[PDB]
């Protein structure tokens, strides 16, 4: 496992309706657990309603 892609989404208010917007994926070196990824994304998008969708480790 040499890298981990974290896929992230945001709940957004558009024309008065709650929708979900895809945010840029971020690929980290090494293995990142889902707990680690959730923590990292909560610090990155301070105060905004973001949620980790998935993590994808790649072996090589």
Numbering used by the authors: 8 to 67
Would you copy out the relevant sentences from the publication that reported this structure?
The genome-organizing protein p6 of Bacillus subtilis bacteriophage φ29 plays an essential role in viral development by activating the initiation of DNA replication and participating in the early-to-late transcriptional switch. These activities require the formation of a nucleoprotein complex in which the DNA adopts a right-handed superhelix wrapping around a multimeric p6 scaffold, restraining positive supercoiling and compacting the viral genome. Additionally, p6 forms dimers that bind to DNA every 24 nucleotides and interact with the viral DNA through the minor groove.
In a first attempt, we removed the final 31 residues (encompassing the α2 together with the C-terminal disordered acidic tail) with the aim of generating a minimal truncated protein fragment suitable for crystallization. After purifying the resulting variant, denoted as p6CΔ31, we efficiently obtained well-diffracting crystals that permitted its structural determination at ∼1.6 Å resolution (experimental electron density is shown in Supplementary Figure S2E). A comparison between the experimental p6CΔ31 structure and the AF2 prediction revealed nearly identical backbone structures, with a rmsd of only 0.664 Å across 53 pruned atom pairs. The central feature of this fold comprises the β1 strand interacting in an antiparallel orientation with the adjacent β2 and β4 at one side, and with β3 on the other. Furthermore, a 12 residues-long α-helix (α1) bridges β3 and β4 strands and packs against β1, β3 and β4. This spatial arrangement builds up a compact and well-ordered core facilitated by the burial of numerous hydrophobic residues (V13, V15, L30, F35, L39, M41, A44, M48, Y52, V57, V59 and V62). In the crystallographic structure of p6CΔ31, residues 1–8 and 68–72, which would extend β1 and β4 strands, respectively, are not visible despite their inclusion in the construct's sequence. This likely results from the absence of stabilizing interactions provided by the α2 within this region when the protein is in a dimeric state (see next section).
